[PDB]
């Protein structure tokens, strides 16, 4: 036989473009003197092009290094290496009905999304790229100048590739020098064991802290969606440009007891997830587990929902209701004529956020009461099922 | 130093989902008796569910093996292993305002595009997927039955995950057995030499057949977009599920001559591309080179334009006009007082279609007259430039 | 620039042949009826070919699945999937000066090492392989038969490829069906931070449990060299065919204290490694840390020493003396006129043994007193160094 | 099912260490002023350390960039980037029974082989490596100096790691800056079709130029073993540091004819390989095909024989006799009562040498008459076999 006789693990994938894995210095393709996007504190040199501390500046010193995080629809969030803020088409107006591009914290709003279009010079054949907004009805452009300090804006004044128009020069970017993004290694998958079956009356089984996890999925989260206040902005973006979100399953013990012959016991079974754990996941990732056990995304992470759920191998939630905490008091009777070790597990769905360096930031676990079972020693067909109620 | 002192080649990427790389047997998740999509020649067993030879059938024998080719917008073309036809939402009506899904040759029309949505059972937690059309206003569904021979259709009768509705069962697919797609290996990139400079008066330089190609890009073309009449449907889909389209550049010699001291010569320079070569690329790939030297895609390949151009590293064309053939008669005068070997090259942009087995199906070359040069021995500053006109 | 402006992690490599990653059913190339190596409990069918419970049997039922672990010199240890024992050329004699091949626990002795040679049939061109011992002066061969139950032995009766000899048939193996080996994923490397410098007088710095590890190396250990009594033989070989040995470094705090102006303190500094930890590494891996901080290997792991040290990025030890434990009482005086927070770290060299499933079996740490430093707040040039003695 | 229902191609592997893939500047670990191995034309600054134009020099200018090609036994050939010559322990004597290390063309002799040993400073913990010859009875060492221009030699004066000896400093190398080796991409494997069967009486079948090759193996050949006089030394080493040797199989047509009912034909069948083709392979690669169809290696390539044959998937030859050319006149009779299209193929074993840029340098083909067949239309059981003789 050509393939193994046993199952083998799979590589988890989370493919990204090169521009989503590098912070590039973005230069103007036509500038004679090295001008490109900049984080200069000096003001605009040009009337009708005013700057302030929010402006995305254009200068031939103090360059920005910018990563393009890929959204599910192919647009990009353009994020800065040094302060972790993003470009944002501000709804205010400059002259001539243009909007300034500003630096702002990431919100996931439409105004922070940019479509990259690959184009070029019709005469020379040289390639460059541009950024558009509003379904290609606005283009990003320097304010007036190719070779003086100015600001970046978006304009609705767009020109066709032919006949070539001077103004298009102000929209033409090329990649220059770059820093690599820090990206976690994706773990390999692993198989989940069967729900653990006791081997003797003294086998108390496996506690959640000791249960072997099966790795089932993983996503690379842009750091702009992660709130990790243990780091500052610059360390997060430079050393943890993407965080790892692992999806793992394990059997989570509800309880384990010898139930003597003909005896009743009452046992609390706690499953689902607590509001405390759900509120933590909202705060850290803008995600929570829906009442259908799918993943629900608020606006900050929403733009990456399809990629993240594809990588985790868990579905998008179809309900806005949060999964709740189930706390149920269960009364069990062992009708057998022998003492029986009983143990109940439900499947835990564990999401773990990690830094590039492997540190665990947080885990959040949903105990899935729809996927549970009671195992025992001795067991069927020697004994009859434990009776509930 | 941590990185090499020389440049190194890069891997070309063309990432695809697993479902775009496998022909899967698609089974109904709830069927008790093994029913799924089928290529049975037997008719539908059910009134109000009529079948004919175009129907996509549902049966527990003669399964189809279906690949999902990924479109630029995340939708899929669903294509059959055995006959290379695709699923198509026919505009005709069954009862209850539903449309039949039929098998049809690939056109690239909207009616052949399907959105896959990952869902699951709200009670059991078991996962499955569905197919929607028309911006999630129709879902694909068996006609009436889970466990008898019937047809596949699309319906606008969709139900929410909660409360669970019986009818949703008819829409629920899972992957089963599969065959791997045949996929070409992507070549590694290589650097283009400088435009060749003669080393002596007898150096006649390099003819196009002998010029070293630099590999600059590559795309994997679904075979549904390739017309390769040397193969039948079944061989193309099973052994060449994707073709390779390489993008390579080389210097293409226009002419090489010793032009004696103080002598004039007249030389025809042929550049651009011929209509014959453009018509061939249209026929084989539904693509041509635009007058801006970008890539232009007709409807058959249009759905994959962004992925293909990203892989080739050539831009999308912004003009519908075809690149033409330039045939120019040039008159040159060597004003130097010595005999000078002159050679003129322009950059050739070569697209080569290959089978999985490495066979070359076709090459098409656009000679780019915007990127050309005349080199010589002896040369500047010893001689003055050749004068044109 | 063509390469990043920052350092990037590297993949750790630990390349192995395919036969070292699969347990293959080894069949005789010439047998007409499916005979190959077997774990049959039935006895040899042949006089002068006696079997007992140690014999490696040859039969057409109950096949063995055998992995070939690659030794530093290119020889192989041939190990069984089901019981984890290895083939061994027993020094006892059968008739005709031959030795029986037996199953035995792994020792790493010369008698358990086999040279695989790729050969073939001179007439037909068909390929097969053989196993030799004693620098190709003995070949492994069935005892007498191609197509009856017998034993495996080694013989000094070897024949040249030409003219073809009948007896060579008994030596000719081919690979058949197989199970994949379970192999851990190799971690990516990471950079070690500078020795931590306090930022205030109240910064007590980082305890060993909390120190970030830099991954610097890793080796895949054949499970035959690992003593992991938490598993039985069959689970170890099938689910942990190779263990992972990670090499990581971190800064290990000896102490942290404010030493007030003009005050003396006495502090115990514990470095090196304890005999208890060294004896554990000997028991589990047959390795210890030499007094030169290199790796020392006893016979069980010795055969893989070069591969293991190449993967860990630590050198082979040149001394048989074990690294000892240094327990030193240090007297420090702060001569500065201000209270100074002082902290001392030495570099820890941490070796961690993991299962395929990621569970940590053990860690062993050597605290390297040759690579240590005292940092402080405030620090040079504001203060003078802490004086020792 | 978990694996495909069809066969899938495999990656060919040819794993190499990092030092075999980079030309490193080798510096002395203890030098205060940047000294290391050098290609300086200036003479040795030191009495008793004479230099000439063959010496491997040691200086702090004009560094060498040296690749270490890995031999089957783990030793290295140390080769220069700029002239493609190798280090060689010359049998002449300096003072004190030492030998000079010289630069020499590659021969594959024992005097050009070096064992790299990873060591370090016993006091500081800093790592470095050394080079030994003659089974670790000589070490490479600077002649006398750490920080003046001198020569490289080998000495039998070796000191233990403990107690540390001054002289060991002269043997201690570290890697510095580097250039990446140019290395070909390894092709993916492909399956060989069945021997082609005609489909009609007019099907004349497939000529060798048109036969589809199955890729079955590949090796990366150090350029020191390849004679490629189309390039100079510097271009070969910098741009083709390794050549690719592909192993491919195809069906090579001996003849195709309609043999009419009851008619005889006489046909020349040419198989094996010509002396002309064997002499070419000897000249270019120092290899030929043995009479057993295995690979035979002369001294220049012998050191890499195991790696090369493992990569090609062809065995080492067990005979010194060259495969010859078989030229046989065959008389065939068609005893059937109908006209039959007959075609005879034998399996061709094709070895193709390629540059990094993909150019084909040469092919050599052995037509294997042991693996041949006559196919026909019509065929068995409709017709009787063609009778030979």
Descriptive report:
Four copies of one chain form a homotetramer. By secondary structure, chain A is mostly beta strands. The first copy, chain A, folds into two domains: 21-180, Trefoil (Acidic Fibroblast Growth Factor, subunit A) (Trefoil), CATH 2.80.10; 181-389, no CATH class. Chain A contains four helices and 21 strands. In chain A, the strands form six sheets. In chain A, strands 2, 3, 6, 7, 8, 9, 10 and 11 form an eight-stranded antiparallel β-sheet that branches. Chain A has a four-stranded antiparallel β-sheet with strand order 13-14-19-20. A three-stranded antiparallel β-sheet of chain A has the order 15-18-21, with no helix packed on it. The longest helix of chain A has 11 residues, at 275-285. Chain A starts with 21 loop residues before the first strand and ends with a strand. The A-B interface holds A 13, 15, 72, 74, 118-120, 122-125, 127, 160-162, 291-294, 306, 309, 315-316, 318-319, 347, 368, 370-371 and B 13, 15, 72, 74, 118-120, 122-125, 127, 160-162, 291-294, 306, 309, 315-316, 318-319, 347, 368, 370-371.
